[PDB]
Design a protein around this ligand. Structure first.
Ligand code: PLP
Ligand code: PLP
Ligand code: NA
Ligand code: NA
Ligand code: NA
Ligand code: NA
Lengths: 431, 431
């Protein structure tokens, strides 16, 4: 039973609480699309852990590779190269769009964003960073100065020179031009304000192709291109954070591929490591040469370590080999349609958005008023869990609560169906 | 051969350069105290990789545990607890001094410092951070604002409210009081300046017990106690970063044990993971309760993940079980004496300092003038490598270059001797 006295005692006495509230089960094992409690109850992992386990839990290939390396090549002094590092870097250059040639291998998303922000500052000689008011780039420093979704209050001033602009949100438009939501005009409007506050040191713009923490907000068509143009005109670099969208999740290897806009710096993390701490930045040769001439330095304990790199490589091999990006379109289509059917059934589902296997469901009081549902999301979440479906909901000011759905790319037809089933029941139970 | 055309081509074309310069070998395997090149040449790893592999490379126990977990429990959604997380947290509370009760499990040193700095700010409601002018706390944000050893130039303003004070350096004293280097008077002097610049928002002081990146600088006797008192009087928390000193390296489980001063927040990283990315913060129940009441939030992709925690636990078990802290005193004594004998032989060795298995050797022009050796350290380093001894030297302004010596706690008597031997030869060859 999950109700182990010692376990719980130890947990209340020895853990720092870092947000949220601990689920009251004891996870004992994980496999594929499920996690299992101490009672052996199977729980469908509809979020791939923290949106990272693209290949599901404990995938045999990964297990196999972690094994070969753990006993052969583990961690090395930063100046020592090895084949997995070189092969992974080479691989990354080859599958990202042209113009993305050189990679830096790290451990976390925050590190990846910091490394990128630092290169941008060095190369341009400027220091102001612009991001979205609903962004999520991590908790460490700069990455945190660039994060507006949560964590700005009570901890003192943020980094000097940070600015945010509103993200385009088609579901709850707020900028009209001749009767329609004109998101490009909104962009123009936001940049003009920026231009007025800047001290003339605009270095880069950092963005997520799909705002994950911010409520599964997809940048609309032509937006990225318009953004990139805004940057070029100002001599700023464009940094794209694909921690959540990269590695096939949205139906393309990289989300940037869909739009066709290639960023100056691309950062990867959650999905690259598939559960293990591996992260990376990918940039053009020209940018790298410059940073190098300028003395760029970025040292971490685990940069270029062989084990994590061997794992990332294996992840890419599997994804390519098994046609997992394609699978993302197919299963994503199956899931989306199912969510749309739920929306047919229940008046509380206000919107179904996202792409591929990165979907969001916005819960509302009523479909016309679009009033956010107060307390219902929480109920729903509770029932899902009870029914055996692990979900995650996020609540942002001025929005209804949003369920972030993201099953493993390896998810089966049955699992998709099972999850759709448990969800409906949960909702029915929660009204 | 290490001279593989494709390898090198790929490396020059696809890797971001992040400082330093790549060693020209291809590491193919690692075991115990050695790494092996493509020619199968054994290289004695006198730095435990990047000062992390406390148990040497690929230790069978670690290999064993990585194995059990990789296939059973890997990564989980942040709100789900598991036994390795709870056991590790419990273990940490039990082996750190009284007053250190609750732990947060992360991935990197920078994250650990950020988490700690953020808790300090929240809890005190203030935001100014004080550190040492020679410190190294990581590259990510706050951790970086607190880092003065390198990386401050060219990347724009640092965090608002950062101040640094000089660290006590007995080898090159600069503060005299009645004919002697009075490091406590120096401290008083530094704080008075701080007091004058502060806006009245002093939140915490962050320090390393032994400044690693800064040149293996040991805080002298009574210093820590005096520091802690300076903090208490100002309502500031004391954060101790034991990334490099923790986990038996200096001869005690934690360096803080030697002095007997227990910090308000203790951070751990390099040594805890023994090569893998695992980090942690340990604080008192009182601090944690408060932060919690205040809404403390710290989310990372890998917080509380089962695999890394299982590894950390195994590391502690081994260390405790094999009497590795004690071993640190014994081998450290053997190494130190050997370094002292080298110092007998060569006029270029100006100082041998450090503790346990964390030692530094400062290279100088001449023993009296204490003039820093220009270019010799680099030669020496080169010859070591040629002879098969992997070393790391750091050069700081106003100091001679310093070799940072840190073999695995599992290092053998023979290995210590072999390294001492190769070192002498290297030096003899480099004059
Ligand atoms: C290396 C180090 C850190 C940061 O570790 P990373 O994993 O590189 O972020 C922090 N403090 C000290 C004293 C260190 O040596
Ligand atoms: C999670 C996340 C990051 C940071 O990852 P961490 O490992 O938690 O530091 C950065 N960007 C995005 C878009 C993320 O979702
Ligand atoms: Na490394
Ligand atoms: Na490319
Ligand atoms: Na986790
Ligand atoms: Na304790």
């Amino acid at each position: 039973l999950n109700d182990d006295a010692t376990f719980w005692r130890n947990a209340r006495h020895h853990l720092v609480r870092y947000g949220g509230t601990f689920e009251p089960m004891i996870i004992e094992r994980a496999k594929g699309s499920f996690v299992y409690d101490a009672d052996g109850r199977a729980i469908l992992d509809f979020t791939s852990g923290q949106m990272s386990a693209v290949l599901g839990h404990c995938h045999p290939e990964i297990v196999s590779v972690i094994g070969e390396y753990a006993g052969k090549l583990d961690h090395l002094f930063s100046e020592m190269l090895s084949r997995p590092v070189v092969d992974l870097a080479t691989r990354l250059a080859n599958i990202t769009p042209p113009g993305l040639d050189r990679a830096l291998l790290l451990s976390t998303g925050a590190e990846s964003n910091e490394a990128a922000i630092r290169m941008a500052k060095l190369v341009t000689g400027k220091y102001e960073i612009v991001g979205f008011a609903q962004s999520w780039h991590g908790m460490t420093g700069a990455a945190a100065s660039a994060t507006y979704s949560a964590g700005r209050k009570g901890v003192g001033p943020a980094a000097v020179g940070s600015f945010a602009i509103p993200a385009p949100f088609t579901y709850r438009p707020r900028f009209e031009r001749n009767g329609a939501y004109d998101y490009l005009a909104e962009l123009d409007y936001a940049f003009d304000l920026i231009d007025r506050q800047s001290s003339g040191n605009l270095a880069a713009f950092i963005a997520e192709p799909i705002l994950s923490s911010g409520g599964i907000i997809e940048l609309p068509d032509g937006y990225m291109a318009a953004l990139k143009r805004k940057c070029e005109a100002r001599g700023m670099l464009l940094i794209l954070d694909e921690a959540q969208t990269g590695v096939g999740r949205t139906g393309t290897m990289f989300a940037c591929q869909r739009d066709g806009v290639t960023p100056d710096i691309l950062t990867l993390s959650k999905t690259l490591g598939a559960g293990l701490p591996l992260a990376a930045i990918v940039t053009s040769a020209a940018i790298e040469e410059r940073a190098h001439e300028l003395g760029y330095l970025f040292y971490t304990t685990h940069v270029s370590d062989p084990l994590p790199a061997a794992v990332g490589l294996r992840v890419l091999d599997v994804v390519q080999r098994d046609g997992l990006v394609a699978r993302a379109n197919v299963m994503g289509d199956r899931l989306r349609r199912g969510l749309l059917d739920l929306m047919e059934r229940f008046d509380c589902i206000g919107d179904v958005r996202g792409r591929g296997l990165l979907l969001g469901v916005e819960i509302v009081k009523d479909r016309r008023t679009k009033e956010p549902a107060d307390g219902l999301g929480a109920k729903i979440t509770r029932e899902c869990m009870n029914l055996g479906l692990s979900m995650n909901i996020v609540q942002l000011p001025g929005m209804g609560g949003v369920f972030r759905i993201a099953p493993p790319l390896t998810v089966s037809e049955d699992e998709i169906d099972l999850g759709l089933s448990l969800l409906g029941q949960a909702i029915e139970r929660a009204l």
